[PDB]
Amino acid sequence: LSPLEQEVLDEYERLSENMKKLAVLLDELASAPATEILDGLRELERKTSLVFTLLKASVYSIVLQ
Amino acid sequence: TLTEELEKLEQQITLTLQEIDSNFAKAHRIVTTSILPLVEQYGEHSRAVWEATKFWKQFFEASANV
């Protein structure tokens, strides 16, 4: 059947195309920022500790001393 | 000579007493002059400093209180 052929063929073509888009987009979208995120965040720990963690340090130091 | 030195040193004693009173009252005037308003000004500015610390202390309290 040519109508059934057209239906399943076009529909599965769309699915295959969308899945190729899925693979590429998902991989880049979730890979590229991830490294940048964790790098900036380990540095963020190194920075935020110098405002907040030191605040806890000074507080403990004074209250205990 | 005897009674002479007696009266002389007696007058010296009285004069010295009055001098001691003068120095004493001078110290009294110095304290009563402006020392009290001076420390009042000191405490006033100190009070302002406490108003300064009134802000940042809240954050230290917050750190202790998570």
**Cβ A55–B64 below 8 Å, yes or no?**
no
A63 touches B at CB < 8 Å? yes
A21 touches B at CB < 8 Å? no
State the count of interchain CB pairs (< 8 A) between A and B. 8
Q: Which residues of B touch A56 (CB under 8 A)?
A: 63
3-class DSSP state for residue A3? helix
* Exp. method: cryo-EM
Give this entry's resolution in angstroms: 4.5
B65 touches A at CB < 8 Å? no
> Rounded to an integer, what distance in angstroms lies between the CA atom of residue B14 and that of residue B19?
9
What ranges in chain A are assigned the alpha helix state H? Answer: 2-48, 54-64
**Cβ A59–B59 below 8 Å, yes or no?**
no
* Count of Cβ atoms closer than 10 Å to residue A62 Cβ: 9
**Residue B50 distance to chain A (closest CA, Å):** 18
3-class DSSP state for residue A28? helix
Alpha-carbon separation of residue A64 from A55, A58, A60, A61 (angstroms): 14, 10, 6, 5
Read out DSSP for B3-54? HHHHHHHHHHHHHHHHHHHHHHHHHHHHIIIIIHHHHHHHHHHHHHHHHHHH
